[PDB]
């Protein structure tokens, strides 16, 4: 806001293992306040990812997260004249947060059967970083590096 610089809230970790990164991922997925369904979805998408990768459950997630994790984004900070696009670095707490949202919205696309299966398909396709979710990352970089004349 204008003057309010109050701190954030502390979220609880997922009820399978201590990993608040995954718990945050559940909430981004959750709609209409249905968290019970949300965690059931990501857990099923976790084993289906682990069996389709041969890795562990949590480590198969980061190797699909830092592939869709951006480092620079576009902010519209004007100079007084035209409000031109300006590339700015991203804070770490927003880094993975922006990444998790992208893979979720990609799951809303590419309708296979169920989104539990679908996001598992996107997390697997993010492993070889050649999906539509990772596509969002490069295009953000495509307008960043191609317009990194402002600093």
């Amino acid at each position: 806001p204008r003057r309010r610089v109050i701190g954030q809230r502390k979220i609880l970790p997922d009820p399978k293992f201590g990993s608040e990164l995954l718990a945050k991922f559940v909430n981004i997925l959750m709609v209409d306040g249905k968290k019970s369904t949300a965690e059931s979805i990501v857990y099923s998408a976790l084993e289906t990812l682990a069996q389709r990768s041969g890795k562990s459950e949590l480590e198969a997630f980061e190797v699909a997260l830092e592939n869709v994790r951006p480092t620079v984004e576009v902010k519209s900070r004007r100079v007084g004249g035209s409000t031109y696009q300006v590339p700015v670095e991203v804070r770490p707490v927003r880094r993975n947060a922006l990444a998790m949202r992208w893979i979720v919205e990609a799951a809303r696309k590419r309708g296979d059967k169920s989104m539990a299966l679908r996001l598992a398909n996107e997390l697997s396709d993010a492993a070889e970083n050649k999906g539509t979710a990772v596509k969002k990352r490069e295009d953000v970089h495509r307008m960043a590096e191609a317009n990194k004349a402002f600093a």
């Binding site: 031109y84 990194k148 402002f150």
Partner: peptide, 12 residues
């Protein structure tokens, strides 16, 4: 490249 406003820039 760098045509237009980006032409008159120190990065260019």
């Amino acid at each position: 490249g760098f045509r237009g406003s980006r032409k008159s820039t120190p990065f260019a």
